[PDB]
């Protein structure tokens, strides 16, 4: 005997939740990348 598939789906759907550590890490990575991009584009005035 076992659970029903629909009950299992409900359990899983309630169980899913974003990971704080992963989200924080990706924010840090995108932050580093965006710092690099912004610093890189700081010299467009020199181009003009």
């Amino acid at each position: 005997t076992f659970y029903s598939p629909k009950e299992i789906f409900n359990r899983l759907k309630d169980s899913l939740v974003p990971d704080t550590g992963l989200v924080t890490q990706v924010w840090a990575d995108n932050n580093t990348k965006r710092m690099d991009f912004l610093t890189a584009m700081a010299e467009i005035p020199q181009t003009l």
Binding site: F2, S4, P5, K6, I8, F9
Partner: protein
Amino acid sequence: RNSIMVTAQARRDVIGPEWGPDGRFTGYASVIGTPDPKPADIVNKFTVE
């Protein structure tokens, strides 16, 4: 001897291959009367809409 182990472990075929014509049996189980029926194995399905 371990080969015979595996052969005897090749049993559990509810009703194994019968005793050999010269008694040369294999992984085999002998039934007494009408064997007990095995109930139908069921499937439980759900669809992710």
